[PDB]
Amino acid sequence: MIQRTPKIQVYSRHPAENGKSNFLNCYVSGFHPSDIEVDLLKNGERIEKVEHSDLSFSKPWSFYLLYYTEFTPTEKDEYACRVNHVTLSQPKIVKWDRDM
């Protein structure tokens, strides 16, 4: 058996073909086993509608998840990604840096 804790990165992107739109991304990389729970949060509350969740693997034993959706942030809103996995004794919350 092998187990690996995911790396978690949270960031925003505007698609070049429609630059007024903005997407909040959580990229969860390099993990095993593949069982996992991932949410986007707005002011501590789970975002229910997340329109994209894309899972892949490289080696048998290494998985990658991009979990993202359109949003409209304001300066007073806090956003985050919350991940649960067998390697994590409590949920890991990674905040979105409004600059990123």
XYZ file of all heavy atoms in Angstrom:
835
model
N 0.846 -1.221 0.000
C 0.000 0.000 0.000
C 0.868 1.253 0.000
O 2.024 1.228 0.445
C -0.983 0.013 1.186
C -0.356 0.078 2.584
S 0.291 1.695 3.099
C -1.219 2.519 3.596
N 0.306 2.332 -0.529
C 0.907 3.667 -0.432
C -0.167 4.727 -0.135
O -1.299 4.656 -0.646
C 1.692 4.027 -1.715
C 2.491 5.330 -1.554
C 0.759 4.143 -2.898
C 3.780 5.383 -2.388
N 0.182 5.691 0.714
C -0.668 6.835 0.932
C 0.158 8.125 0.919
O 1.326 8.150 1.402
C -1.566 6.679 2.197
C -0.810 6.605 3.497
C -1.643 6.242 4.759
O -1.217 6.549 5.873
N -2.793 5.606 4.595
N -0.447 9.159 0.330
C 0.172 10.490 0.129
C -0.863 11.603 0.385
O -1.984 11.583 -0.168
C 0.684 10.659 -1.315
C 1.857 9.785 -1.752
C 2.313 10.053 -3.150
N 3.383 9.128 -3.503
C 3.931 9.019 -4.696
N 3.532 9.772 -5.721
N 4.898 8.145 -4.856
N -0.471 12.582 1.196
C -1.299 13.727 1.514
C -1.387 14.628 0.275
O -0.367 14.864 -0.372
C -0.668 14.551 2.669
O -0.375 13.691 3.771
C -1.615 15.604 3.116
N -2.591 15.129 -0.073
C -2.654 16.040 -1.227
C -2.012 17.405 -0.986
O -2.039 17.930 0.145
C -4.159 16.242 -1.440
C -4.778 15.957 -0.121
C -3.918 14.913 0.524
N -1.457 17.994 -2.035
C -1.084 19.403 -1.999
C -2.335 20.162 -2.445
O -3.036 19.700 -3.325
C 0.115 19.637 -2.913
C 0.293 20.992 -3.483
C 1.674 21.107 -4.167
C 1.958 22.508 -4.699
N 3.436 22.752 -4.931
N -2.609 21.308 -1.826
C -3.842 22.086 -2.091
C -3.446 23.522 -2.462
O -2.727 24.189 -1.725
C -4.776 22.086 -0.827
C -5.155 20.664 -0.404
C -6.069 22.989 -0.995
C -5.636 20.569 1.066
N -3.902 23.974 -3.612
C -3.695 25.349 -4.080
C -5.032 25.975 -4.482
O -5.838 25.333 -5.182
C -2.729 25.377 -5.265
C -1.328 24.828 -4.976
C -0.577 24.506 -6.248
O -0.851 23.512 -6.912
N 0.370 25.361 -6.603
N -5.264 27.211 -4.024
C -6.529 27.935 -4.245
C -6.242 29.277 -4.943
O -5.463 30.090 -4.467
C -7.291 28.168 -2.932
C -8.678 28.706 -3.211
C -7.354 26.887 -2.105
N -6.888 29.512 -6.072
C -6.521 30.661 -6.934
C -7.670 31.017 -7.842
O -8.623 30.244 -7.959
C -5.281 30.332 -7.773
C -5.416 29.058 -8.594
C -5.926 29.078 -9.897
C -4.979 27.833 -8.079
C -6.037 27.892 -10.654
C -5.077 26.672 -8.808
C -5.603 26.696 -10.078
O -5.658 25.502 -10.733
N -7.578 32.197 -8.461
C -8.607 32.677 -9.369
C -8.034 32.836 -10.798
O -6.834 33.078 -10.973
C -9.254 33.979 -8.851
O -8.333 35.063 -8.750
N -8.900 32.610 -11.787
C -8.585 32.741 -13.214
C -9.769 33.333 -14.002
O -10.925 32.957 -13.757
C -8.291 31.349 -13.802
C -7.064 30.610 -13.223
C -5.782 31.263 -13.617
N -4.607 30.545 -13.104
C -3.920 30.853 -12.001
N -4.223 31.897 -11.230
N -2.878 30.113 -11.676
N -9.458 34.234 -14.943
C -10.405 34.753 -15.939
C -10.099 34.090 -17.288
O -8.967 34.174 -17.758
C -10.243 36.259 -16.124
C -10.311 37.050 -14.859
N -9.189 37.388 -14.131
C -11.365 37.605 -14.211
C -9.553 38.084 -13.067
N -10.864 38.251 -13.106
N -11.094 33.437 -17.913
C -10.827 32.845 -19.236
C -10.574 33.952 -20.248
O -11.326 34.938 -20.283
C -12.118 32.070 -19.559
C -13.157 32.692 -18.741
C -12.501 33.276 -17.505
N -9.519 33.816 -21.053
C -9.116 34.883 -21.971
C -10.217 35.274 -22.971
O -10.297 36.426 -23.400
C -7.832 34.493 -22.727
N -11.070 34.306 -23.320
C -12.133 34.524 -24.320
C -13.343 35.253 -23.709
O -14.229 35.683 -24.444
C -12.608 33.199 -24.975
C -11.682 31.978 -24.841
C -11.755 31.336 -23.451
O -12.863 30.885 -23.061
O -10.713 31.294 -22.747
N -13.394 35.348 -22.374
C -14.447 36.076 -21.658
C -13.920 36.615 -20.341
O -14.180 36.040 -19.281
C -15.643 35.158 -21.386
C -16.860 35.918 -20.846
O -16.939 37.157 -20.929
N -17.805 35.177 -20.268
N -13.177 37.709 -20.415
C -12.371 38.169 -19.295
C -13.109 38.786 -18.116
O -12.525 38.921 -17.040
N -14.377 39.162 -18.315
C -15.202 39.699 -17.226
C -15.634 38.585 -16.276
O -16.065 38.854 -15.149
C -16.445 40.405 -17.763
C -16.170 41.638 -18.602
C -17.466 42.188 -19.214
C -17.198 43.043 -20.455
N -18.462 43.495 -21.116
N -15.553 37.336 -16.714
C -15.953 36.240 -15.837
C -14.725 35.779 -15.023
O -13.588 35.936 -15.451
C -16.616 35.124 -16.646
O -15.692 34.209 -17.161
N -14.981 35.252 -13.833
C -13.929 34.947 -12.864
C -14.277 33.591 -12.253
O -15.449 33.326 -11.978
C -13.908 36.052 -11.790
C -12.574 36.154 -11.014
O -12.427 37.035 -10.143
N -11.630 35.268 -11.296
N -13.274 32.743 -12.072
C -13.456 31.391 -11.546
C -12.576 31.179 -10.337
O -11.399 31.562 -10.316
C -13.163 30.311 -12.598
C -14.180 30.248 -13.704
C -14.233 31.253 -14.663
C -15.098 29.206 -13.777
C -15.170 31.199 -15.690
C -16.033 29.150 -14.802
C -16.068 30.143 -15.759
N -13.168 30.559 -9.329
C -12.463 30.178 -8.125
C -12.043 28.724 -8.284
O -12.890 27.861 -8.521
C -13.408 30.330 -6.930
C -12.881 29.918 -5.561
C -11.584 30.636 -5.191
C -13.968 30.165 -4.506
N -10.747 28.456 -8.150
C -10.188 27.116 -8.340
C -9.561 26.547 -7.072
O -8.871 27.259 -6.304
C -9.091 27.138 -9.420
C -9.588 27.593 -10.771
O -9.816 28.796 -11.004
N -9.705 26.651 -11.689
N -9.801 25.256 -6.853
C -9.038 24.484 -5.869
C -8.387 23.318 -6.619
O -9.103 22.490 -7.226
C -9.972 23.969 -4.771
S -9.125 23.048 -3.430
N -7.046 23.270 -6.614
C -6.291 22.185 -7.282
C -5.669 21.288 -6.214
O -4.838 21.742 -5.449
C -5.205 22.753 -8.212
C -4.386 21.714 -8.984
C -5.007 20.718 -9.736
C -2.995 21.777 -9.013
C -4.266 19.787 -10.458
C -2.244 20.848 -9.730
C -2.887 19.858 -10.445
O -2.154 18.962 -11.173
N -6.124 20.029 -6.162
C -5.734 19.046 -5.159
C -4.904 17.940 -5.859
O -5.421 17.233 -6.728
C -6.989 18.477 -4.461
C -6.603 17.541 -3.312
C -7.859 19.610 -3.963
N -3.611 17.855 -5.535
C -2.655 17.173 -6.434
C -1.859 16.102 -5.721
O -1.517 16.270 -4.553
C -1.710 18.191 -7.102
O -0.954 18.921 -6.144
N -1.574 15.012 -6.437
C -0.580 14.011 -6.017
C -1.017 13.086 -4.894
O -0.179 12.574 -4.146
N -2.314 12.867 -4.741
C -2.807 12.113 -3.562
C -3.135 10.619 -3.789
O -3.375 10.179 -4.920
C -3.986 12.872 -2.906
C -5.223 12.987 -3.778
C -6.222 12.048 -3.716
C -5.368 14.050 -4.680
C -7.379 12.144 -4.531
C -6.507 14.160 -5.499
C -7.513 13.192 -5.427
N -3.125 9.845 -2.694
C -3.481 8.409 -2.688
C -3.824 8.042 -1.239
O -3.130 8.517 -0.334
C -2.350 7.491 -3.195
C -2.851 6.171 -3.714
N -2.733 4.988 -3.013
C -3.550 5.876 -4.837
C -3.287 4.009 -3.715
N -3.822 4.529 -4.813
N -4.901 7.261 -1.008
C -5.846 6.711 -1.998
C -6.731 7.792 -2.635
O -6.717 8.941 -2.214
C -6.672 5.714 -1.190
C -6.609 6.227 0.208
C -5.237 6.842 0.374
N -7.500 7.424 -3.658
C -8.293 8.413 -4.377
C -9.539 8.913 -3.596
O -10.099 9.919 -3.968
C -8.747 7.801 -5.727
O -9.482 6.615 -5.499
N -9.983 8.203 -2.547
C -11.145 8.636 -1.732
C -10.863 10.035 -1.179
O -9.794 10.278 -0.625
C -11.398 7.708 -0.540
C -11.656 6.263 -0.952
O -10.762 5.645 -1.611
O -12.719 5.743 -0.556
N -11.792 10.958 -1.362
C -11.549 12.339 -0.961
C -12.893 13.113 -0.910
O -13.855 12.704 -1.550
C -10.512 13.007 -1.910
C -9.821 14.190 -1.201
C -11.169 13.394 -3.296
C -8.479 14.660 -1.880
N -12.918 14.181 -0.101
C -14.023 15.132 0.003
C -13.458 16.556 -0.094
O -12.530 16.919 0.633
C -14.814 14.947 1.308
C -15.973 15.936 1.507
C -16.798 15.700 2.788
O -16.256 15.180 3.798
O -17.991 16.065 2.769
N -14.014 17.345 -1.018
C -13.514 18.678 -1.321
C -14.694 19.634 -1.499
O -15.648 19.331 -2.247
C -12.638 18.684 -2.600
C -12.144 20.104 -2.925
C -11.426 17.710 -2.450
N -14.625 20.771 -0.807
C -15.619 21.850 -0.926
C -14.947 23.220 -1.114
O -13.836 23.468 -0.599
C -16.529 21.893 0.293
C -17.609 20.790 0.271
O -18.419 20.752 -0.680
O -17.653 19.990 1.213
N -15.621 24.083 -1.859
C -15.341 25.522 -1.851
C -16.245 26.168 -0.774
O -17.400 25.780 -0.631
C -15.593 26.130 -3.232
C -14.672 25.668 -4.371
C -15.028 26.331 -5.700
C -13.192 25.927 -4.068
N -15.692 27.128 -0.020
C -16.415 27.882 1.039
C -16.450 29.391 0.750
O -15.464 29.961 0.272
C -15.728 27.712 2.398
C -15.337 26.293 2.829
C -14.584 26.373 4.186
C -16.532 25.357 2.905
N -17.600 30.000 1.032
C -17.780 31.460 1.024
C -18.202 31.881 2.429
O -19.252 31.473 2.927
C -18.853 31.861 0.022
C -19.064 33.380 -0.055
C -20.010 33.802 -1.135
C -20.279 35.295 -1.039
N -21.441 35.704 -1.908
N -17.373 32.690 3.075
C -17.605 33.078 4.476
C -17.985 31.876 5.347
O -18.966 31.909 6.103
C -18.678 34.179 4.584
C -18.332 35.425 3.793
O -19.158 35.943 3.028
N -17.113 35.909 3.951
N -17.211 30.801 5.212
C -17.340 29.646 6.089
C -18.423 28.671 5.697
O -18.509 27.589 6.267
N -19.235 29.045 4.712
C -20.366 28.240 4.279
C -20.053 27.532 2.961
O -19.494 28.115 2.033
C -21.609 29.132 4.143
C -22.051 29.829 5.455
C -23.080 29.037 6.276
O -23.734 28.127 5.725
O -23.257 29.330 7.483
N -20.429 26.263 2.885
C -20.222 25.449 1.699
C -20.949 26.003 0.466
O -22.126 26.336 0.536
C -20.721 24.042 1.993
C -20.470 23.073 0.928
C -21.062 21.735 1.293
N -21.094 20.906 0.097
C -22.150 20.738 -0.691
N -23.320 21.284 -0.401
N -22.038 19.965 -1.761
N -20.228 26.102 -0.649
C -20.807 26.498 -1.927
C -21.389 25.241 -2.567
O -20.664 24.273 -2.842
C -19.744 27.163 -2.860
C -19.148 28.410 -2.188
C -20.356 27.493 -4.228
C -18.002 29.068 -2.965
N -22.703 25.253 -2.791
C -23.423 24.049 -3.216
C -23.288 23.762 -4.701
O -23.177 22.598 -5.095
C -24.908 24.126 -2.846
C -25.220 23.710 -1.432
C -26.367 22.705 -1.366
O -26.213 21.578 -1.886
O -27.422 23.040 -0.797
N -23.308 24.807 -5.520
C -23.186 24.661 -6.955
C -21.726 24.897 -7.345
O -21.260 26.038 -7.353
C -24.097 25.672 -7.652
C -23.946 25.766 -9.159
C -24.738 26.953 -9.684
C -24.144 27.511 -10.956
N -24.661 28.884 -11.188
N -21.001 23.816 -7.611
C -19.652 23.908 -8.220
C -19.691 23.185 -9.562
O -19.808 21.955 -9.616
C -18.547 23.307 -7.343
C -17.211 23.329 -8.110
C -18.450 24.067 -6.016
N -19.567 23.950 -10.640
C -19.874 23.434 -11.970
C -18.834 22.527 -12.641
O -19.171 21.855 -13.615
C -20.301 24.573 -12.900
C -19.272 25.657 -13.138
C -19.847 27.084 -13.118
O -21.086 27.275 -12.926
O -19.049 28.022 -13.300
N -17.600 22.483 -12.118
C -16.536 21.638 -12.681
C -15.743 20.840 -11.618
O -15.216 21.414 -10.648
C -15.571 22.494 -13.501
C -16.247 23.332 -14.550
N -16.790 22.793 -15.696
C -16.454 24.669 -14.626
C -17.315 23.762 -16.429
N -17.124 24.911 -15.802
N -15.647 19.523 -11.826
C -14.844 18.640 -10.975
C -14.145 17.572 -11.835
O -14.758 16.586 -12.228
C -15.752 18.002 -9.908
O -15.043 17.222 -8.961
N -12.865 17.793 -12.137
C -12.112 16.980 -13.081
C -11.021 16.158 -12.402
O -10.061 16.737 -11.876
C -11.435 17.891 -14.104
C -12.426 18.767 -14.873
O -13.595 18.363 -15.055
O -12.012 19.870 -15.294
N -11.164 14.828 -12.465
C -10.252 13.863 -11.823
C -9.391 13.131 -12.852
O -9.888 12.670 -13.905
C -11.027 12.822 -11.001
C -10.203 11.829 -10.155
C -9.502 12.538 -8.992
C -11.116 10.711 -9.612
N -8.104 13.023 -12.531
C -7.149 12.286 -13.350
C -6.128 11.537 -12.501
O -6.069 11.731 -11.286
C -6.432 13.225 -14.341
O -5.675 14.208 -13.670
N -5.354 10.665 -13.146
C -4.150 10.076 -12.541
C -2.933 10.052 -13.486
O -3.067 10.035 -14.706
C -4.428 8.678 -11.957
C -4.870 7.661 -12.965
C -3.930 6.880 -13.637
C -6.222 7.464 -13.238
C -4.319 5.946 -14.579
C -6.620 6.527 -14.191
C -5.683 5.777 -14.856
N -1.731 10.036 -12.915
C -0.511 9.898 -13.728
C -0.036 8.430 -13.586
O -0.518 7.554 -14.313
C 0.545 10.932 -13.302
O 0.821 10.846 -11.913
N 0.848 8.152 -12.624
C 1.061 6.794 -12.113
C -0.233 6.256 -11.462
O -1.085 7.049 -11.051
C 2.169 6.773 -11.039
C 3.563 7.205 -11.545
C 4.121 6.231 -12.548
C 5.594 6.508 -12.868
N 6.086 5.785 -14.085
N -0.377 4.912 -11.372
C -1.525 4.256 -10.715
C -1.934 4.985 -9.419
O -3.106 4.924 -9.049
C -1.072 2.810 -10.598
C -0.277 2.645 -11.854
C 0.526 3.903 -11.958
N -0.991 5.566 -8.674
C -0.974 5.620 -7.228
C -0.865 7.185 -7.043
O -0.555 7.674 -5.963
C 0.166 4.881 -6.502
C 1.498 5.191 -7.008
C 2.256 6.285 -6.719
C 2.249 4.405 -7.937
N 3.441 6.227 -7.414
C 3.470 5.074 -8.156
C 2.018 3.187 -8.585
C 4.451 4.580 -9.021
C 3.008 2.680 -9.443
C 4.200 3.385 -9.661
N -1.110 7.981 -8.106
C -1.093 9.454 -7.965
C -2.274 10.157 -8.654
O -2.337 10.163 -9.895
C 0.234 10.020 -8.478
O 0.294 11.423 -8.292
N -3.206 10.722 -7.865
C -4.412 11.374 -8.403
C -4.373 12.921 -8.314
O -3.662 13.487 -7.478
C -5.675 10.883 -7.687
C -6.090 9.480 -8.072
C -5.372 8.376 -7.621
C -7.205 9.269 -8.886
C -5.748 7.073 -7.970
C -7.585 7.968 -9.234
C -6.846 6.866 -8.785
N -5.191 13.551 -9.149
C -5.217 15.009 -9.349
C -6.669 15.407 -9.557
O -7.361 14.777 -10.358
C -4.380 15.400 -10.589
C -2.948 14.946 -10.488
C -2.585 13.664 -10.895
C -1.972 15.763 -9.908
C -1.286 13.215 -10.755
C -0.672 15.316 -9.756
C -0.337 14.034 -10.187
O 0.947 13.559 -10.046
N -7.114 16.440 -8.834
C -8.504 16.926 -8.905
C -8.457 18.434 -9.089
O -7.814 19.122 -8.296
C -9.277 16.625 -7.620
C -10.728 17.199 -7.574
C -11.657 16.398 -8.498
C -11.273 17.197 -6.136
N -9.095 18.934 -10.139
C -9.374 20.364 -10.272
C -10.869 20.592 -10.034
O -11.726 20.040 -10.754
C -8.969 20.885 -11.648
C -9.086 22.392 -11.864
C -8.030 23.091 -11.033
C -8.965 22.768 -13.356
N -11.174 21.416 -9.031
C -12.547 21.649 -8.583
C -12.738 23.160 -8.664
O -12.077 23.902 -7.947
C -12.685 21.146 -7.145
C -14.072 21.109 -6.535
C -15.039 20.234 -7.002
C -14.386 21.915 -5.436
C -16.286 20.170 -6.406
C -15.636 21.856 -4.826
C -16.581 20.976 -5.317
O -17.838 20.894 -4.751
N -13.600 23.613 -9.571
C -13.739 25.050 -9.811
C -15.123 25.505 -10.312
O -15.900 24.715 -10.879
C -12.640 25.523 -10.749
C -12.798 25.146 -12.209
C -13.294 26.064 -13.123
C -12.390 23.901 -12.686
C -13.413 25.749 -14.476
C -12.499 23.579 -14.044
C -13.007 24.510 -14.926
O -13.119 24.207 -16.271
N -15.407 26.788 -10.105
C -16.706 27.358 -10.469
C -16.632 28.892 -10.614
O -15.769 29.530 -10.009
C -17.804 26.910 -9.455
O -19.096 26.944 -10.090
C -17.796 27.756 -8.141
N -17.508 29.455 -11.448
C -17.640 30.931 -11.578
C -18.065 31.600 -10.244
O -18.894 31.059 -9.479
C -18.620 31.290 -12.720
C -18.568 32.750 -13.109
C -19.273 33.088 -14.430
O -19.928 32.205 -15.029
O -19.169 34.266 -14.854
N -17.459 32.747 -9.940
C -17.810 33.543 -8.748
C -17.653 35.031 -9.003
O -17.117 35.444 -10.024
C -17.083 33.093 -7.461
C -15.616 33.511 -7.325
C -15.096 33.745 -6.064
C -14.756 33.609 -8.420
C -13.758 34.092 -5.880
C -13.417 33.956 -8.251
C -12.917 34.205 -6.966
N -18.131 35.824 -8.054
C -18.023 37.275 -8.137
C -17.601 37.785 -6.768
O -18.443 38.155 -5.958
C -19.384 37.893 -8.533
O -20.380 37.435 -7.613
C -19.782 37.470 -9.920
N -16.296 37.775 -6.490
C -15.819 38.174 -5.178
C -15.968 39.689 -4.922
O -15.877 40.489 -5.855
C -14.346 37.778 -5.220
C -13.971 37.863 -6.650
C -15.189 37.384 -7.384
N -16.239 40.055 -3.672
C -16.105 41.438 -3.219
C -15.022 41.457 -2.147
O -14.691 40.417 -1.576
C -17.413 42.005 -2.617
O -17.599 41.486 -1.295
C -18.607 41.663 -3.482
N -14.481 42.639 -1.872
C -13.383 42.796 -0.898
C -13.686 42.294 0.522
O -12.762 41.868 1.240
C -12.929 44.259 -0.863
C -12.114 44.648 -2.093
C -12.412 46.043 -2.597
O -12.903 46.886 -1.807
O -12.146 46.301 -3.793
N -14.958 42.323 0.918
C -15.373 41.864 2.248
C -15.770 40.364 2.320
O -16.130 39.868 3.394
C -16.503 42.758 2.777
C -16.013 44.140 3.253
C -16.985 45.292 2.944
C -18.371 45.106 3.555
N -18.356 44.948 5.031
N -15.703 39.647 1.197
C -15.986 38.202 1.175
C -14.687 37.409 1.394
O -13.652 37.755 0.814
C -16.618 37.809 -0.176
C -18.100 38.207 -0.292
O -18.842 38.145 0.719
O -18.526 38.578 -1.413
N -14.743 36.363 2.238
C -13.642 35.383 2.412
C -13.988 34.041 1.734
O -15.047 33.476 2.004
C -13.343 35.118 3.895
C -11.966 35.597 4.373
C -11.345 34.736 5.502
O -11.978 33.767 5.996
O -10.194 35.037 5.891
N -13.074 33.539 0.896
C -13.246 32.252 0.190
C -12.138 31.267 0.600
O -11.021 31.680 0.948
C -13.246 32.439 -1.327
C -14.417 33.253 -1.842
C -14.337 34.643 -1.938
C -15.610 32.636 -2.206
C -15.423 35.398 -2.409
C -16.681 33.367 -2.658
C -16.587 34.741 -2.755
O -17.682 35.439 -3.211
N -12.462 29.972 0.549
C -11.550 28.921 0.984
C -11.853 27.574 0.318
O -12.923 27.399 -0.276
C -11.596 28.775 2.491
N -10.892 26.648 0.402
C -11.083 25.249 -0.020
C -10.890 24.365 1.197
O -9.936 24.557 1.947
C -10.108 24.824 -1.131
S -10.436 23.164 -1.828
N -11.812 23.429 1.396
C -11.812 22.515 2.553
C -11.718 21.079 2.022
O -12.563 20.655 1.209
C -13.086 22.665 3.391
C -13.069 21.821 4.663
C -14.279 22.012 5.543
N -15.502 21.723 4.808
C -16.714 22.178 5.120
N -16.898 22.978 6.164
N -17.752 21.845 4.368
N -10.703 20.343 2.502
C -10.393 18.990 2.036
C -10.353 18.009 3.225
O -9.797 18.313 4.295
C -9.019 18.918 1.254
C -8.654 17.460 0.891
C -9.034 19.809 0.022
N -10.953 16.842 3.020
C -10.901 15.705 3.950
C -10.359 14.512 3.200
O -10.791 14.239 2.057
C -12.301 15.382 4.500
C -12.771 16.375 5.552
O -12.307 16.336 6.699
N -13.713 17.258 5.178
N -9.443 13.794 3.847
C -8.705 12.677 3.267
C -8.151 11.830 4.422
O -7.992 12.337 5.538
C -7.614 13.214 2.315
C -6.805 12.149 1.618
N -7.190 11.550 0.428
C -5.600 11.621 1.928
C -6.267 10.677 0.063
N -5.293 10.699 0.958
N -7.938 10.536 4.191
C -7.479 9.644 5.259
C -6.138 10.071 5.907
O -5.881 9.745 7.058
C -7.385 8.177 4.814
C -8.784 7.616 4.614
C -6.509 8.001 3.536
N -5.315 10.796 5.152
C -4.001 11.318 5.636
C -4.113 12.562 6.544
O -3.122 12.984 7.167
C -3.076 11.687 4.420
O -3.736 12.655 3.611
C -2.739 10.476 3.568
N -5.315 13.145 6.609
C -5.577 14.379 7.343
C -6.441 14.091 8.575
O -7.596 13.693 8.456
C -6.274 15.405 6.437
C -5.529 15.889 5.176
C -6.427 16.685 4.181
C -4.295 16.715 5.545
N -5.889 14.279 9.765
C -6.647 13.961 10.984
C -7.831 14.905 11.237
O -8.787 14.521 11.902
C -5.731 13.904 12.197
O -4.955 15.061 12.284
N -7.761 16.128 10.716
C -8.896 17.053 10.702
C -9.001 17.673 9.297
O -8.041 17.611 8.535
C -8.718 18.128 11.775
C -7.707 19.228 11.465
C -7.664 20.330 12.524
O -7.118 21.414 12.289
N -8.239 20.056 13.690
N -10.164 18.256 8.950
C -10.293 18.944 7.671
C -9.236 20.024 7.507
O -8.953 20.755 8.450
C -11.684 19.598 7.750
C -12.403 18.881 8.777
C -11.411 18.308 9.728
N -8.649 20.097 6.326
C -7.685 21.129 6.024
C -8.387 22.240 5.250
O -8.975 21.986 4.211
C -6.513 20.564 5.221
C -5.320 21.517 5.149
C -4.090 20.912 4.435
C -3.244 20.039 5.330
N -1.909 19.631 4.704
N -8.301 23.468 5.754
C -8.918 24.627 5.094
C -7.795 25.530 4.609
O -6.908 25.919 5.381
C -9.880 25.392 6.019
C -10.996 24.480 6.526
C -10.480 26.654 5.306
C -11.846 25.082 7.586
N -7.819 25.822 3.316
C -6.828 26.679 2.699
C -7.561 27.875 2.143
O -8.414 27.736 1.289
C -6.048 25.933 1.606
C -5.130 26.864 0.858
C -5.240 24.743 2.257
N -7.205 29.055 2.632
C -7.882 30.293 2.246
C -7.415 30.766 0.883
O -6.267 30.524 0.481
C -7.643 31.390 3.296
C -8.337 31.117 4.617
C -8.187 32.254 5.629
C -8.926 31.896 6.920
N -8.966 32.993 7.922
N -8.328 31.402 0.156
C -7.981 32.084 -1.067
C -7.376 33.430 -0.659
O -7.999 34.234 0.059
C -9.213 32.286 -1.967
C -8.972 33.127 -3.176
C -8.014 32.947 -4.115
C -9.714 34.296 -3.581
N -8.098 33.922 -5.070
C -9.121 34.774 -4.763
C -10.799 34.994 -3.040
C -9.600 35.903 -5.448
C -11.269 36.130 -3.712
C -10.667 36.567 -4.905
N -6.149 33.652 -1.094
C -5.552 34.989 -1.059
C -6.206 35.832 -2.159
O -6.070 35.514 -3.346
C -4.048 34.864 -1.293
C -3.303 36.146 -1.026
O -3.818 37.229 -1.354
O -2.179 36.051 -0.488
N -6.934 36.882 -1.769
C -7.637 37.752 -2.720
C -6.724 38.281 -3.835
O -7.203 38.734 -4.867
C -8.264 38.942 -1.989
C -7.221 39.878 -1.393
C -7.814 40.847 -0.399
N -6.886 41.119 0.693
C -7.067 42.049 1.624
N -8.146 42.827 1.604
N -6.154 42.205 2.575
N -5.416 38.240 -3.596
C -4.414 38.672 -4.559
C -4.118 37.603 -5.607
O -3.581 37.913 -6.675
C -3.119 39.016 -3.813
C -2.403 40.201 -4.400
O -3.056 41.249 -4.596
O -1.184 40.089 -4.645
N -4.449 36.354 -5.295
C -4.104 35.192 -6.132
C -5.301 34.644 -6.920
O -6.410 35.163 -6.808
C -3.526 34.078 -5.245
C -2.194 34.475 -4.576
S -0.943 34.929 -5.799
C -0.671 33.312 -6.531
